[PDB]
């Protein structure tokens, strides 16, 4: 009998200890309750969710099942089990638990919201939006549901009630911070919403504390460090993105370009081999390659790092998918650094330095960051473009440089069998520009090939491949030949109403102008048309193309006249892609790091004239460029020149800069010095 009443005392006592934040005590008391009365549903469930908090996901799962066995109609256990299964990468099982909770109780708001998260994670946004809507009809005061729904509406550019939604988001966060709860907005989404910098940093810090808490359970002693060095710094780059991922498209040449007499490089991969060349290249080029995806336990993973005797541990993930920040919370290296992958602060006590530059992160804005700033000599950004897209080093015009374009790794066959020549043109300053022009006055078979959807054609015995030796033409993407094409190739979530208003503003003032965007995702296309229409411009003047493979994408950009950056959150990589083809990008920097990346890139490129200071200047710079043919020609030439002359795409300069920064970090450590802001130059 009760007995079951004794089990009640302990369960509630464990509950009390859990409210106060004594997680170990609670666990022990829930265990004691189950030793006393094993068939106790509520206690299995409570123990499971405490076990889930501590990162013991496998054990939690065992006790949720015991709860559900004893009480089959325990909808709440099904729901939390679904979350544990989610965290364990088992999207399939999570889906069934949430389904089951809804079958038990169709009015269970959380289960609808949890389900919606699955849909959102899998890129199924319309379905996620229904489920979040459902959750909010059943429970209107549901911060988690509301903030995730808000994020889905960003992804799809649904801006209905935008201004009140943004304020409601800000209310919920500030409220949550004051009540000392973990907020409903993810630190990585932070940069989209009008939160104060202090707010964004607090969200970040709370995620960092989560990492410390999860890790406190291991009861490890702090690592003890080597204090003096006599030759080589051991640097460890830790990332889940070594493979086919934008991060490797930026940095893959860097490990192999490091001066091996100064530093020994270790690349720690957090994800499995995906068999791609990018993973192979980083594997070969890097002096040391370790795969930590084979070491699931964060405790052991930290140990391996400590055992490799690493001085500087570099976080390339921050709060992004695949991160294992618990490793950094264990402090397996005396100095720990954020670099490249996450455009924001960690807010973590266990991160010392962030790698940036003076444009991206001016000292005036240092309070944004928990980390001490460390300045690269020029921009903190890089790209492997010089190595990945050598065929895009220059273009060959066929017959204006952006209507029909040929690119090749080897131009021999074409130059040997057609009239290709390097004309000069003078443009009013007074500048001389060189073009390579292939003239064959037979547009027919080139247009005919595109018109019929042909894979290939042959100009005078030479095989030319349809870009959809390669040919790219405005027809391929439905762009008018005489149009002035403004482009942006970012995920649509980066666009807000103020951005779009400015773009319609420039389109209204530029005679034959068109806006080129991407179905990223497809379902956003409609919303953008509707709003454009509402702003007083024909929807037909905004042309959308499909998300393309990396090569086609960078190659397409050659057809744009001018690229327009998104001031809400700049296009970090795509803007590199576009610059590589010498297409100017006009930007307006804000205050967050993610707002200022393009400015940093352009500053390094030596083109500050493309960096606006107000919305008015942004629009005016873009209007002048679509309106003054000669000025546009001169600036595209300057951008083209700068792309090979400047450090922006120079991967070896970049390695040197990292080295100086790492040396400086060590010097401070070798002396008794606390981290403080440093610079390379
Ligand atoms: C705001 C933010 O979080 N930024 C992060 C940065 O701060 C980090 O520095 C980046 C590397 O760590 S990741 C991330 O950078 P982002 O620019 O947001 O890249 P994102 O993940 O949207 O995809 C663009 C890719 O799709 C390719 N792309 C694009 C269009 C197309 O048609 N085809 C195509 O292959 C493009 O060539 C690109 O390769």
TrEMBL record:
> Boundaries of each O-GlcNAc transferase C-terminal domain copy?
156-657
Q: Tell me where it mainly resides.
A: cytoplasm
TPR repeat residue numbers: 7-40, 41-74, 75-108, 109-142
Q: What class of enzyme is it?
A: transferase
**Where does it live in the cell?**
Cytoplasm; Nucleus
Query: Which keywords does the record carry?
Result: Acetylation, Biological rhythms, Chromatin regulator, Cytoplasm, Glycoprotein, Glycosyltransferase, Lipid-binding, Nucleus, Phosphoprotein, Repeat, TPR repeat, Transferase, Ubl conjugation
Write out the pathway annotation from the protein's UniProt entry. Protein modification; protein glycosylation
A single Gene Ontology molecular function, please? lipid binding
The record's GO CC annotations read: cytosol; nucleus
* Gene Ontology BP, a term: protein O-linked glycosylation
EC annotation from Swiss-Prot or TrEMBL? 2.4.1.255
Q: Which family does it belong to?
A: Belongs to the glycosyltransferase 41 family. O-GlcNAc transferase subfamily.
Q: What is this protein called?
A: UDP-N-acetylglucosamine--peptide N-acetylglucosaminyltransferase 110 kDa subunit
Q: Which organism is it from?
A: Drosophila melanogaster
Full-protein interval shown: 352 to 1059 of 1059
């Amino acid at each position: 009998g009760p007995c079951s009443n004794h089990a009640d005392s302990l369960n509630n006592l464990a509950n009390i200890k859990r409210e106060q934040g004594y997680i170990e005590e609670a666990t022990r008391l829930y265990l004691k309750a189950l030793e006393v009365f094993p068939d106790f549903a509520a206690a299995h469930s409570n123990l499971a969710s405490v076990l889930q908090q501590q990162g013991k996901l496998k054990e939690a799962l065992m006790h949720y099942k015991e709860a559900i066995r004893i009480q089959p109609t325990f909808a709440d256990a099904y729901s939390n089990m679904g979350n544990t299964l989610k965290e364990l990468q088992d999207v399939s099982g999570a889906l069934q638990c949430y389904t089951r909770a809804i079958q038990i109780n169709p009015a269970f708001a959380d289960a609808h919201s949890n389900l919606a998260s699955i849909h959102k994670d899998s890129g199924n946004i319309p379905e996620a939006i229904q489920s979040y809507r459902t959750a909010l009809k059943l429970k209107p005061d549901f911060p988690d549901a509301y903030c995730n729904l808000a994020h889905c509406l960003q992804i799809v550019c649904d801006w209905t009630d935008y201004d009140i939604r943004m304020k409601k988001l800000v209310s919920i966060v500030t409220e949550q911070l004051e009540k000392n709860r973990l907020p409903s907005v993810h630190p990585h989404h932070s940069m989209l919403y009008p939160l104060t910098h202090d707010c964004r940093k607090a969200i970040a810090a709370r995620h960092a504390n989560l990492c410390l808490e999860k890790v406190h359970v291991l009861h490890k002693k702090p690592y003890n460090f080597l204090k003096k060095l006599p030759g080589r710094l051991r640097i460890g780059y830790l990332s889940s993105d070594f493979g086919n991922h934008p991060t490797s498209h930026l940095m893959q040449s860097v490990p192999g370009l490091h001066d091996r007499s100064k530093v020994e490089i270790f690349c720690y991969a957090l994800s499995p081999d995906d068999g791609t060349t990018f993973r192979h290249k980083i594997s070969r080029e890097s002096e040391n390659f370790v795969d930590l995806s084979q070491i699931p336990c964060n405790g052991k993973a930290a140990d391996k790092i400590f055992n490799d005797g690493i001085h500087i541990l570099v976080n390339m993930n921050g709060y992004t998918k695949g991160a294992r920040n618990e490793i950094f919370a264990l402090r397996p290296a005396p100095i720990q650094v954020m670099w490249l992958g996450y455009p924001g602060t960690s807010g973590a006590s266990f991160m010392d330095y962030i790698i940036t530059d003076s444009v991206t992160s001016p000292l005036e804005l240092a309070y944004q960051y928990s980390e001490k700033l460390s300045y690269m000599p020029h921009t903190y950004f890089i790209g492997d473009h010089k190595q990945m897209f050598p065929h895009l080093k220059e273009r060959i015009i066929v017959c204006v440089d952006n209507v029909t374009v040929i690119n090749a790794t080897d131009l021999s066959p074409l130059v040997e069998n057609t009239d290709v020549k390097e004309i000069k043109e003078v443009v009013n300053k007074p500048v001389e520009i060189t073009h390579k022009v292939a003239e064959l006055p037979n547009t027919t078979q080139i247009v005919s090939m595109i018109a019929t959807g042909q894979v290939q054609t042959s100009l005078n015995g030479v095989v030319v491949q349809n870009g959809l030796i390669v040919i790219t033409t405005r027809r391929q993407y439905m762009l008018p030949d005489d149009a002035v094409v403004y482009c942006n190739f970012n995920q649509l979530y980066m666009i807000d109403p103020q951005t779009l208003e400015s773009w319609v503003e420039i389109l209204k003032n530029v005679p034959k102008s068109v806006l080129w965007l991407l179905r990223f995702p497809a379902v956003g296309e409609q919303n953008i048309k509707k709003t454009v229409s509402d702003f007083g411009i024909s929807p037909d003047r905004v042309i959308f193309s499909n998300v393309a493979a990396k090569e086609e994408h960078v190659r397409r950009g050659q057809l744009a006249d001018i690229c327009l950056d998104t001031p809400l959150c700049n296009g970090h990589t795509t803007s590199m892609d576009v610059l590589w083809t010498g297409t100017p990008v006009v930007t307006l920097p804000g205050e967050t790091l993610a707002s200022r990346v393009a400015a940093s890139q352009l500053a390094t490129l030596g083109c500050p004239e493309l960096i606006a200071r107000t919305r008015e200047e942004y629009q005016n710079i873009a209007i002048r460029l679509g309106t003054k043919k000669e000025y546009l020609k001169a600036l595209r030439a300057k951008v083209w020149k700068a792309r090979v002359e400047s450090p922006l795409f120079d991967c070896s300069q970049y390695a040197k800069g990292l080295e100086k920064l790492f040396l400086r970090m060590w010097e401070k450590y070798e002396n008794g010095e606390l981290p403080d802001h440093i610079s390379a130059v």
